[PDB]
Design an enzyme around this catalytic site. Structure first.
Site, short mmCIF file in Angstrom:
data_model
loop_
_atom_site.label_atom_id
_atom_site.label_comp_id
_atom_site.label_asym_id
_atom_site.label_seq_id
_atom_site.Cartn_x
_atom_site.Cartn_y
_atom_site.Cartn_z
N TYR A 1 0.80 -1.22 0.00
CA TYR A 1 0.00 0.00 0.00
C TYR A 1 0.84 1.28 0.00
O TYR A 1 0.30 2.36 0.26
CB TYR A 1 -0.93 0.02 1.22
CG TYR A 1 -2.06 -0.98 1.11
CD1 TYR A 1 -2.98 -0.91 0.06
CD2 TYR A 1 -2.21 -1.99 2.06
CE1 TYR A 1 -4.02 -1.81 -0.04
CE2 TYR A 1 -3.27 -2.88 1.98
CZ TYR A 1 -4.17 -2.79 0.93
OH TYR A 1 -5.24 -3.62 0.88
N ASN B 1 -13.97 -5.02 1.31
CA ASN B 1 -14.34 -5.29 -0.06
C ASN B 1 -13.61 -6.46 -0.66
O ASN B 1 -13.49 -6.54 -1.89
CB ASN B 1 -14.24 -4.03 -0.95
CG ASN B 1 -12.84 -3.49 -1.06
OD1 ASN B 1 -11.91 -4.02 -0.51
ND2 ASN B 1 -12.72 -2.37 -1.77
#
EC number: 2.7.4.6
Lengths: 150, 150, 150, 150, 150, 150
Positions: free
Chosen positions: D51, D114
């Protein structure tokens, strides 16, 4: 041998209930090769010939009537042990007694509306195939997935 | 009107990949009625006639070649808006761009191997049906589920 | 006890036929916990060690050859009765004889291409797990769904 | 070109919800080839590297925390247009806005849960693959189904 | 907020076509929580109240008639964005125009037989819930899967 | 006779695991008619009455406790041989021993968390139906698909 064939016919109840693709998909998944396929409304002649073994029984009339009452999807599948394997995938005569997982076990409730016919032996398969199909309607060269057979 | 028909053909890649039943099941679930169905290996003549609109393009040869390279499952489905609806269920020409949920969106990756043909218009449907099927091969009386139509 | 583990390997035919996710999903649905997972192409050494019980039989060579012929998805599942339960979900050696519902019953046709390996006992599971996986490749703390176990 | 690769990771919510096999099956069906696959619990280092693009944003901490909170199934899929195609099959960032048919459209409700990560570009795919996998963990020779590509 | 509720009713065509479980499963998979559920044959009063917004239109009579023509499975689902999300999962008014993947896109062909009702807004949801359900018929404390919400 | 009814209850583990629609769909596919359906959190009274046969056994307390620990989806299905057929589709008491294909065979691992209750006899069905449902909550006139029964 891997060129064994069986005859299956989705009877008019299975066609009317929208089960044609669900049934074909089960045999495709298994790795059997579709070697003939057509929809037809059986005539009386073909029906009585199809059910000729029962012709001395009283329920013969009902069989002939039902199968000519609507469209039928006739198919021929090829593969090793396909005749017994396809029966196993069908279930037993009575849908209520057919194991979950099998076509009649999953979808059927009544003997007279048991969705699908499969040949009960190689010899009845060969007779039924020659009954329902012309030779030209059958693939001559079949290639299965190479990952199916050793 | 609820008697609209379209022509669909699972091309030889879709047949080879075991997708025939998955595809028929999608249209049966939708409520469209199977009105004709057979497996065949297209001849050159039928293929060039099928793809006659492209016959002046260079990719015509490839289309004709591919579709005659193996078995094809040709079918005719009947229902309201079936021609546009069946296209929508197919996806767009490029499988990579077809939405998840659609046949080409779920199963395809390459334009030249895009699994299935569906008529692009009622007029191309009528021409294609009359090409691939004899009139006798098509149900004349169709009854859908009564819960489908108002 | 709920910390029983078994070793399963989707063999190269099952990987080649696109059955990896279908097989993992069956065990996830059942409530078994994925405790190790990797794809690899087995070496000869691992294969002969894996099939060491057969090493005096003539078919040993074929087993070793096939399993090193392509990628394999090795996995370890944890749960109560997982070793016997996973066998039951697999079916019997011959796919043709495996009940519909089972992996081999649904997808297989040939003994030599029977898709998946599962440990036949807790002791063979423990040996196989220690063979195919490093300890670091296995979850140490496993939490199942709380609705699975009393 | 048909050797494009993308990186997908079923995040710890998707693993905890038993969706690993359902997700892999969707990509296998599509015709993409599994080229790398392992389960792991990401360390902090890998997460922050994964990330790294967000590292100046306040939500970076939450991303790193969540992804190291449990097992992750990392995989690499190969195929034509796989990077964009896999995104399309995933849906959009918000699961509530993702179309039915897509993974997040079918299974997700919350941005922070998600389910799955997919590379957003070939260049982020190549960086992510080289991050999460050793070269030895990836198939060097890939053979897809011959019926997928022209 | 995660306590948003919507009202869905599988109309008598969807119940008659055996789609009740397929529809509930889609919402369960999505992660929405079943908060109320019953089968009933709507009376005229409830129907006219349900469709009160149309009561000045000529098609009101047809709506009331159809929905009281057979059993209906009424349900209330809870979750974040459930009202808009459930509409999206339903499709648009015309099933023929609904995307594959959506309930009406997958199963429907006719506006008047479009299977399922879902509230079009939180305010119509709240009115519809209070119409079709007693407060005692609704779960007061709902726990979703912990892997759904951040 | 085709008006046989059985009582099924998805217990709180099956509801919590999102299996309500999967279970209803299995019985709808089979051709059994949904004749009653509601979600409720059983009270102690109903639970002890439901499990009254075990009331002298030590495990009675655990049964009553578990079933009142959360929502339950109670349903009544109608059809020929539905009581035995529904048991067969459920599997045996121990999920680990239940065949793949059956509900408990596919989804369960623990006796105490075995997902679903089905009446074990017509007489226990009739008692259970009259326990869990008011007469007004049950369809009086049932029409199955005409293609199910001869």
């Amino acid at each position: 041998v891997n060129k064994e064939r069986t005859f299956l016919a989705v009877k008019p109840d299975g066609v009317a209930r929208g089960l044609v693709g669900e049934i074909i998909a089960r045999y495709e998944k298994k790795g059997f090769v579709l070697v003939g396929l057509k929809q037809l409304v059986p005539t009386k002649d073909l029906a009585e010939s199809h059910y000729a073994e029962h012709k001395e029984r009283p329920f013969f009339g009902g069989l002939v009537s039902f199968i000519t009452s609507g469209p039928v999807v006739a198919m021929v599948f090829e593969g090793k042990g396909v005749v017994a394997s396809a029966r196993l995938m069908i279930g037993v005569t009575n849908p209520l007694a057919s194991a979950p997982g099998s076509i009649r076990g999953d979808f059927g409730v009544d003997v007279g509306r048991n969705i699908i016919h499969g040949s009960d032996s190689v010899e009845s398969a060969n007779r039924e195939i020659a009954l329902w199909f012309k030779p030209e309607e059958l693939l001559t060269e079949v290639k299965p997935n190479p990952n199916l057979y050793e």
